[PDB]
């Protein structure tokens, strides 16, 4: 009835062959390209990857290996078992019945 | 944050949360007893005030 016709689809490359696809305004289009590329790639992915690579012993995985070596060295030197079936000292436990 | 700050911050959090849990359980028990017995400040439904009663001699003697 009284309805506007459906507009034809706009090709951003016609008015701006150098378009980055961000905006129809060339100056804004270029700025929006730079923030995405700089904050996305230069910062988050490059610095974030470097940050992740040098995390200080994520969840003390390295400490546990050093600690295990210390215990293995001590327990073998003294003729103790490397590891015991019982985690908790039976002298501190009181079974029923 | 260092591991000691987080560790002892966790203890402070646990103490508060543990204390709140105990108080929550008591309140349910206190409420149950007050409602069943009516011997506490809660569930104290009103009764007529005795200061509304007239104690003066009446027109007739038997009362």
């Amino acid at each position: 009835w009284q309805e506007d016709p459906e507009p034809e689809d706009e090709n951003l490359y016609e008015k701006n062959p150098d378009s980055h696809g961000y905006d129809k305004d060339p100056a804004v289009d270029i700025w929006n390209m730079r923030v995405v590329f700089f904050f996305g790639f230069s910062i988050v992915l490059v610095l974030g990857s470097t940050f992740v690579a040098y995390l200080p012993d994520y969840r003390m995985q390295e400490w546990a290996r050093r600690e295990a070596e210390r215990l293995v060295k001590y327990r073998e030197a003294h003729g103790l078992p490397i590891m015991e079936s019982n985690c908790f000292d039976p002298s501190k436990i009181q079974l029923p019945e | 944050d260092g591991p000691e700050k987080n560790y002892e911050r966790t203890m402070a959090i646990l103490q508060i949360e543990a204390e709140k849990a105990e108080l929550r359980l008591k309140e349910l028990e206190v409420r149950r007893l007050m409602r069943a017995r009516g011997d506490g400040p809660w569930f104290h439904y009103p009764t007529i005030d005795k200061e509304l009663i007239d104690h003066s001699p009446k027109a007739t003697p038997d009362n």
Binding site: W1, Q2, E3, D4 | -
Partner: protein
């Protein structure tokens, strides 16, 4: 104070301002009947406010800066297109008539608001009481569908019932051939395409329906083209009317307060002129409605409520 119950309680009552000259007078007739001239003379002689006939852009003249708005904001209603293509498929004919009724409805409210607020009478050229003659003429020539007439009567039924009729109805009876001769003399290219049958239907609607009805509740004065030229005689007749009919005799401060509370609120006046009766001629789809509204908000001094538009020089916004 802005008018309301508080102002009413403090003495702002219609009867304290309305005199014996506080009359609403409407001038009616066929096309090219010289009613515009006679209406202008009655107002001057009687010291009443004159209201030109409400056209497509009447609302434009009462809001913003007063200048007419582009046609898209009027819905593309065109009186010129109506003469050239009265049966056009864009539904221009009824859309114009529905728009014109709303403009008259607004003007009648402006007129009543003026009369009740100042006590000065007003002179109108046609009104919402006589607007139907064009609708009947359009229908009888096949320019509009029957469903259009039904929509018009639905809107009229829930709007006209709120307002009092004119104190005086002045009808200027110019025979159709004389009008048909005056239209040609006036040299309007599109208007010259009118037909006598359309003009005859307009005349029949006045005499068949309008004049008999208004006589039941108004003082009706009739004149010919010659008798109409004598403005002093017409004004002499008006000043000697009795006023013993119609609902104006039942009015009092209480009822007029309620009437003034309505006519001052233009959105309440127009409330039912856009009832959701989906009729092709007057229905606008969402996308067109959306973008036309966005364009309207961009017009100078239209984004914000009047008084808060910096782009037109309003000041002290941070304290208003």
């Amino acid at each position: 104070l802005q008018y309301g119950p508080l102002a009413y309680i403090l003495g702002e009552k219609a009867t304290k301002k309305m005199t014996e000259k506080s009359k609403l007078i409407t001038v009616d007739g066929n096309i090219c009947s010289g009613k515009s001239k006679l209406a202008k003379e009655i107002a001057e002689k009687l010291g009443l406010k004159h209201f030109p006939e409400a056209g497509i852009h009447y609302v434009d003249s009462t809001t913003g800066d007063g200048k007419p708005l582009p046609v898209q904001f009027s819905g593309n209603c065109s009186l010129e297109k109506f003469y050239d293509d009265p049966k056009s498929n864009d539904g221009n004919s009824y859309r114009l008539q529905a728009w014109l009724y709303a403009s008259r409805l607004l003007q009648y409210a402006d007129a009543l608001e003026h009369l009740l607020s100042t006590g000065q009478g007003v002179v109108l050229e046609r009104s919402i009481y006589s607007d139907f003659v064009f609708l009947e003429a359009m229908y009888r020539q096949g320019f509009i569908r029957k469903q259009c007439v039904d929509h018009y009567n639905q809107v009229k039924k829930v709007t006209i019932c709120e307002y009092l009729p004119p104190h005086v109805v002045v009808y200027v009876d110019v025979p159709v051939p004389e009008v048909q001769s005056r239209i040609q003399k006036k040299g309007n290219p599109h208007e010259m395409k009118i037909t006598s049958a359309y003009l005859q239907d307009i005349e029949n609607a006045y005499k068949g329906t309008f004049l008999p009805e208004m006589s039941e509740k108004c003082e009706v004065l009739q004149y010919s083209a010659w008798e109409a030229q004598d403005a002093e005689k017409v004004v002499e007749d008006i000043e000697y009317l009795k006023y013993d009919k119609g609902p104006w005799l039942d009015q009092n401060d209480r009822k007029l307060h309620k009437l003034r509370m309505l006519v001052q609120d233009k959105l309440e006046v127009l409330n039912y002129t856009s009832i959701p009766v989906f009729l092709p001629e007057v229905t606008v789809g969402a996308h067109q409605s959306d973008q036309v509204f966005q364009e309207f908000t961009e017009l100078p001094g239209r984004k914000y409520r009047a008084g808060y538009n910096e782009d037109v020089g309003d000041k002290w916004i941070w304290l208003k």
